[PDB]
Structure formats: C-alpha cells, structure tokens
Paper text:
Previous studies showed that proper introduction of disulfide bonds could stabilize the flexible region of target proteins and reduce the conformational entropy by locking the protein into single desired conformation. Here we developed a comprehensive disulfide bond prediction algorithm that not just increased the success rate of predictions but also improved the quality of crystallized target proteins. The theoretical and experimental results both indicated that with relatively lower values of conformational entropy, proteins would be more stable and readily crystallized to higher diffraction resolution.
The continued disulfide omitted electron densities of the side chains suggested that the disulfide bonds are successfully formed in all crystallized mutants, which are [name]-[name], A20C-Q25C, V16C-A29C, and K27C-A79C in BRIL and N14C-C93, A43C-L74C, and C102-R125C in Flavodoxin, respectively. Compared to WT BRIL, three mutants ([name]-[name], V16C-A29C, and K27C-A79C) show relatively better or similar diffraction resolution, lower conformational entropy (ΔS) and comparable B-factor. These disulfide bonds are located near the middle of helices I and II ([name]-[name] and V16C-A29C) or between helices II and III (K27C-A79C), thus directly strengthened the linkage between these helices. The BRIL proteins with disulfide bonds [name]-[name] and K27C-A79C have lower entropy, consistent with better diffraction qualities. For BRIL proteins, the simulation B-factors are consistent with the experimental values.
Author numbering: 1 to 106
Amino acid sequence: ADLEDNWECLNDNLKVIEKADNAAQVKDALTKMRACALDAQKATPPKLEDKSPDSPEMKDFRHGFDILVGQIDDALKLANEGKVKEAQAAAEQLKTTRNAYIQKYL
C-alpha cells in the first residue's frame, strides 16, 4: 500500500503487458499500472521527506506521474482499438519515463 509496493506494481504489470497475447490482457494490466501510478503520485519518496510538499523535486516527482499517466492513457487508447503490438511498444517506453523521472527519488 506504500510507495515501493506501487513501484513494484508498475514492474509486474509491465511484465504482464510484455507477455500478453491480446488487447484485453494489455488493457487490464495498463489499468493496474494507472491505478498504482495514481497511488504512487500521492506518496512522498525517500529522497524528499525533508523537502516541502511544493519543492521543485516534489514537483518533478508528481509530474513524472502525470506524464506517466498520460502515456498510460495513450497506450490504453491503442489497446482499446485492438492495436496490441502498438500498445505493447508504448508500454516499453513507460519504462524510460519511470526511469528518468521517478527513480532518482527512490
């Protein structure tokens, strides 16, 4: 229920998407990613407990999640049109956002 759990939820569902055979499986996993991303967005990461809630780093942290959620939405749109492989490729790129925006605060 904490950050770390929500982060590993992103990792597990990225694996679900990588291994998926159909669009419905990709949609389910992207749904879980989005829910976990929203919960993570509300946490205070271990690099920033001393900082003010409105600090530039905390801004960075939460905006990494707004960016991530928007990209999850873009992948969901692909999956909702049945474009499985396109949705899987979009999900791979979610890793680049996750790594560049959020990892440095964990």
